[model samples]
Target: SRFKVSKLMAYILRHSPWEFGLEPDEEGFVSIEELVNAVRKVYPWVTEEYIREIVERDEKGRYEIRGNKIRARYGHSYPVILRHEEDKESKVLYHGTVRRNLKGIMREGIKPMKRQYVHLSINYEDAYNTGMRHGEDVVVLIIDAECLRNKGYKILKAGKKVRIVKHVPVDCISGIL
Candidate 1:
């Protein structure tokens, strides 16, 4: 069966840095090499082969690898505005390290990004296992899919509005978007 877009996003977020034999982008989109380097910045233990393995495992081709740019586009796509609620504005989430320490490592910790920016309540265990491949303190913004829906946000296709924070369980093909 085709995996849902939500599941794909959760999967990609959890198993990112698929930096296998991907080449680097010197001046354009994000290249595989750049991805590896980015991950290497935080995790020296992670190898290029490891990233490749995860991407290969995702057979749906739900991921995109252009020049060097990467983002959840395929399965993570959500329409703007809804039945009644309109998008306020796109929010930016900046974070620190993904690995803190023994006390914070593997624990659900929340830190402020820019301003008026709050990451949705995240599943630490899930994020750790899926989002942060290496054991590092990471920053992530949890967009609320439910809240979006309740507020009546619109999607590109004639469909339901997305929530604020869509939760993705570990064992499922996708998450609740």
Candidate 2:
């Protein structure tokens, strides 16, 4: 698991920094020294360059590095507001889920659950790829972004293909693809 360190860093940086005694500041910025010390306890090979590489090479651009601070760009379990601009208008958005959860999702819409925001895919293919992570059979739900915007829902462009929202009501769903 060459990327194991990256994943572990995400968990510690975004979700449970306190669990590892790596407390991030109010803005979710953890000092590079603090992060290195914490991660090095278990992953002695982790270095500042390795952390920077993980952030630089990540396809989703999940991590951000500042002067002497680092933080996960999105997918936070704890409360730490990440800055993002709103996409007021769009054609469609996609959400990935397993077949077994389709019924619940359609009934309850999609909630963020453990994470602070509900992650959406801007395209079908990315949604399908994400759904496959939950199960072999994936259900890619088409979200009506225009409808959502008209309804006053806020959508944020988190990455090239990733969007974030507080929630998506069932009526805002276009259909499954």
Candidate 3:
């Protein structure tokens, strides 16, 4: 039941909340009470306290809760306003991509394409793994995190290996492989 519950939370919070008739606030928080009720439609065992327990101890720092609301920490396919402190420490980052779109990316720069922010990995292994998940010939794009920050792009570190930004331009792409 815990496994089932987390998977449901992922879909609702990170992918499709509208499907549940739940609306996350600008910062992507939905009332826990509201979410608990929403869960009732499927898993009646869920409660506000039960959810708190699950979220607080869950590994990977995948969710955030403040007061009576909660939101997934990262991996959103739907739009949500987020305000993370500007990451000034990362000198370089990696973004996994496909070779087919490599040229287009070079010209227009890397766009979010789907999600609210461009998902970046702290290192190459994770980045390449993500590229593999894209279902194409994998390519790794080296991001000049320092340059982007100096240029005033709002890059944010979201988790252990994931960072994000509103946009990434060609000048910020240090290399492509």
Candidate 4:
């Protein structure tokens, strides 16, 4: 896979920096040098410029790069405190899921389950694609972003279309699309 390095980088930042012996801060950021050294052990071709391209060119905007540091934007199995203290106005977002999960999602709302946050799509098509990641047939559910804001849920931006939240309450679902 041409994008295999991207996946591996995401895995390191998103899951197992500790497993790779890279020291990440509480917010899951690690020194660019540390990451390169770790990844280079597997792929001798690893370079900072090449790595920058991976994060910069990523279609989903999954990674964040700051000065000499890097980290995944979200989708962490480990905990991190990424906040959207200043929020923008929005109406609704879409959540894509499979059929088997729809019942539990509607009954209890969507929880992160494994990842640190529930990823919400910026639009229906994006959400449909997101659902396809889970199943061939997808259920694109509308989330009541207005209600969520009223209840003080932080809708952190992951990318232009990706929003991350700690949880989505049952009452916050508008309906299935």
**lDDT of candidate 1 at residue 17, scale 0 to 100:** 28
Superposed by TM-score, candidate 4 places the C-alpha of residue 31 at a distance from the truth, in angstroms, of 0.7
* Alpha-carbon TM-score of each model against the true structure: 0.26, 0.85, 0.87, 0.90
**Better model by lDDT, 2 or 4?**
4
Tens digit of per-residue lDDT, candidate 1, span 136-159 = 455443443334444453312111
lDDT of 4 by residue, 1-177 (tens): 338888899889988998889878888799988898888888988898889888888888888888999998777888788754334666899999998998788788899976768889878999998899888878898998989988888888877678988799999998987
Q: Which model, 2 or 4, shows the larger TM-score?
A: 4
**RMSD vs true structure, all candidates:** 13.7, 2.3, 2.0, 1.9
Task: Candidate 4: count the clashes.
Answer: 0
Candidate 3 regions exceeding 4 Å error are: none
Stretches > 4 Å off in candidate 4: 84-87
What local distance difference test score does each model get? Answer: 0.34, 0.84, 0.84, 0.85
Evaluated with TM-score, which candidate comes out highest?
Answer: 4
Which stretch of 10 consecutive residues in model 2 shows the poorest summed lDDT?
Answer: 81-90
On lDDT, the stronger of 1 and 2 is 2
Q: What is the lDDT of candidate 3?
A: 0.84
Residue runs of model 2 more than 4 Å from their true location after superposition: none
